[PDB]
C-alpha cells in the first residue's frame, strides 16, 4: 500500500523517452535504493515503450505495479506503486500529471520533446508521487 515510482515518458517508438522521473524508496535503504531505482525507471521507461499511447498499462511484479497512463496528444506518462494502490487515484494522478506536463509548456511546444529534464521537470508529478504514497490520499 505504498507507491514506489512515478514519472512521465514520451513514446519514442520502441523506447520510451525519459520525460520525467521521480523515485520513491522508503524500504529500499542505502543498499536497494540504487538497484531498485534502476528497477523502477527501467520498468517505467519500458512500460511507456510498451504503451503505444491511447492505452494504459499495469505491470504487476512480485511486489510492484507499474501503472501506465498514455496521453491524448503525443507524450505518455507512467506510474508505479504497490498492488495496494487503487487505480482510481492513479487515474486522477494521471489527470493532473498529463495536464501538468502539457501545461508547463504549450501542447505542441513539447509534442514529443525528445529531450526532457526528468531530474528537474514536473515538480508536480514529483510532489504527487511523494504524497500519493497512500492508497488514495483523496488528492490531499
Swiss-Prot record:
Protein name (record): Synaptobrevin homolog YKT6
EC assignment: 2.3.1.-
Keyword Cell membrane: yes
Membrane disposition: Lipid-anchor
One GO cellular component term noted in the UniProt record for this chain: endosome
Single annotated GO MF: SNAP receptor activity
Keywords, in A-Z order: Cell membrane, Coiled coil, Lipoprotein, Membrane, Methylation, Palmitate, Phosphoprotein, Prenylation, Transferase
Organism: Saccharomyces cerevisiae (strain ATCC 204508 / S288c) (Baker's yeast)
An example Gene Ontology biological process: Golgi to endosome transport
Similarity remark: Belongs to the synaptobrevin family.
Entry superkingdom: Eukaryota
Top EC class for this record: transferase
Domain Longin per the UniProt entry, residue ranges: 7-129
Entry keyword annotation includes Iron: no
Subcellular location, record wording: Cell membrane
Amino acid at each position: 500500500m505504498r507507491i514506489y515510482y512515478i514519472g512521465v515518458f514520451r513514446s519514442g517508438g520502441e523506447k520510451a523517452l525519459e520525460l520525467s522521473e521521480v523515485k520513491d524508496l522508503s524500504q529500499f535503504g542505502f543498499f536497494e535504493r540504487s538497484s531498485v531505482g534502476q528497477f523502477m525507471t527501467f520498468f517505467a521507461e519500458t512500460v511507456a515503450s510498451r504503451t503505444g499511447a491511447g492505452e494504459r498499462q499495469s505491470i504487476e511484479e512480485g511486489n510492484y505495479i507499474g501503472h501506465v497512463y498514455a496521453r491524448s496528444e503525443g507524450i505518455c506518462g507512467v506510474l508505479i506503486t504497490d498492488k495496494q494502490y487503487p487505480v482510481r487515484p492513479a487515474y486522477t494522478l494521471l489527470n493532473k500529471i498529463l495536464d501538468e506536463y502539457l501545461v508547463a509548456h504549450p501542447k505542441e511546444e513539447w509534442a514529443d520533446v525528445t529531450e526532457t529534464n526528468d531530474a528537474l521537470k514536473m515538480k508536480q508529478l514529483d510532489t504527487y508521487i511523494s504524497k500519493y504514497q497512500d492508497p488514495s490520499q483523496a488528492d490531499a
